[PDB]
Design a protein around this ligand. Structure first.
Ligand SMILES: [Mg+2]
Ligand SMILES: [Mg+2]
Lengths: 274, 274
């Protein structure tokens, strides 16, 4: 009986609950419940607030969990990413008033307001700087005008909120907030089950007809996750079938066309088990 | 320029934003903003997550704030309630498996999971008991089945979530979570302005005709917040006009009737300034 924790609420909830339904696990039979067991699949789900998720995967009271990477990058628990889930991903970073051109160097002796104080601190120690880290529970983009901080650190999502506070981001992302499946045989089955759901959400099938001399190029354009190559009666052609990432399927299709690919057809898939 | 903080999000937000609009202050002109200033009323609003609210009213970076009483009962900041706002009020308490009849005595050496660890701890010290307090960020009613705790402490709202986890509450409420206006002449004007909005939301006007000999009884049934008494040409009658609380206006009307009150009429009001 695998015990698995899932965000009970917030932005990582509906999407994580959907992924597991998509994989044939039972849903909770009410929304106020914080537990369901699936008799068929032998799992016991628990529904926790994302930040209590890493911790309890680290102390061993849970076999797996779903949280955001920023939380784990910030938890300090003994846990490891076993899977990138593809949703809620954004750059985590620093930002300060649109006045200047900031550097991570300008952080020395500043107060930085952030919801992920430990994450900021490890990073700073790493870059050789010392500054003052203040914890806030949210609404960080206001700490500079309330006069509590000099700069911030947060996930920059749409960026709107930033600019609306005349903050600008600056520096390499400190983390990427992606939902993640973490751990500390029935465990591989769960992993694969989950993975097949993700790959089905992140890739499409491309079927195209590619000229033999472009075979090489074609396959650097679509390596697929083992692409299929089926030589056509015309020695000068070969049918190719590959999974390609969905966010950039059009550019890819355009690439194919520029090298002589024909009948380019993109189609959805649901799961993969391979 | 009064600086005032308001929950940026969650359950205490829409209601607190409405109260202040109801009082003639400007609203933020977008929902991603965490600040607005009202040029007319001379105030600068800030929009913070409720728990960063008490703290910044205590360090003096904010003149007033709106949060929940459980937060302040749990903050430890130097702040005082200046006004009960009438919304989000529930009993805060302890609960454990519906097995037995618990006592606060049964808490000795248990682990208690709660989102308000300091609040639990002051209470325990107060009652002479020692136990182990664990912090969770939410979803506390699950800590007992995940096996992390033996009892919980939380706001019991509708109670559904409790019973759905076979927890039962037990003991006097440790706090009452009511939204509250906290502080550390333009300040009295703000207070009154806010208060007039609340009283308009919590009371109605009752106008009734009461017999002279029941005058005494009548006025213990409705003391109003200075009731009005206007003797009618008939010496045996006197018209009374009082504000009475809205949650229990029907029982009150029934009381009046039982003592001979006639033409009992309940009506809404919007604000009071008195
Ligand atoms: Mg294939
Ligand atoms: Mg009156």
């Amino acid at each position: 009986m695998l015990r698995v924790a899932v965000p009970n609420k917030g932005a990582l909830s509906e999407p994580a609950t959907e992924i597991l339904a998509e994989a044939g696990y039972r849903r909770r039979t009410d929304s106020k419940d914080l537990t369901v067991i699936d008799p068929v699949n032998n799992v016991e789900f628990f529904f926790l607030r994302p930040k209590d998720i890493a911790i309890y995967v680290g102390s061993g009271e849970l076999d797996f969990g779903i949280t955001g990477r920023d939380l784990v990058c910030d938890s300090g628990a003994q846990v490891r990413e076993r899977l990138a889930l593809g949703f809620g991903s954004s750059s985590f970073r620093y930002a300060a008033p649109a006045g200047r051109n900031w550097t991570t160097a300008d952080l020395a002796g500043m107060r930085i307001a952030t919801a992920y104080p430990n994450l900021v601190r490890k990073d700073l120690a790493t870059k050789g700087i010392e500054a003052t880290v203040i914890r806030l529970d949210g609404a960080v983009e206001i700490s500079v005008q309330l006069g509590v901080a000099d700069a911030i650190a947060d996930v920059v999502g749409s960026g709107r909120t930033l600019s609306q506070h005349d903050l600008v981001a600056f520096g390499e992302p400190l983390c990427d907030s992606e939902a993640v499946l973490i751990e500390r045989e029935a465990r591989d089955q769960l992993v694969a089950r989950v993975q097949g759901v993700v790959f089905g959400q992140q890739y499409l099938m491309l079927d195209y007809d590619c000229p033999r001399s472009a075979l090489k190029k074609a396959t650097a354009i679509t390596p697929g996750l083992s692409p299929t190559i089926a030589p056509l009666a015309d020695p000068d052609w070969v049918a190719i079938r590959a999974l390609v990432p969905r966010r950039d399927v059009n550019g890819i299709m355009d690439e194919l066309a520029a090298i002589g690919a024909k009948a380019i057809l993109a189609s959805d898939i649901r799961f993969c088990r391979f």
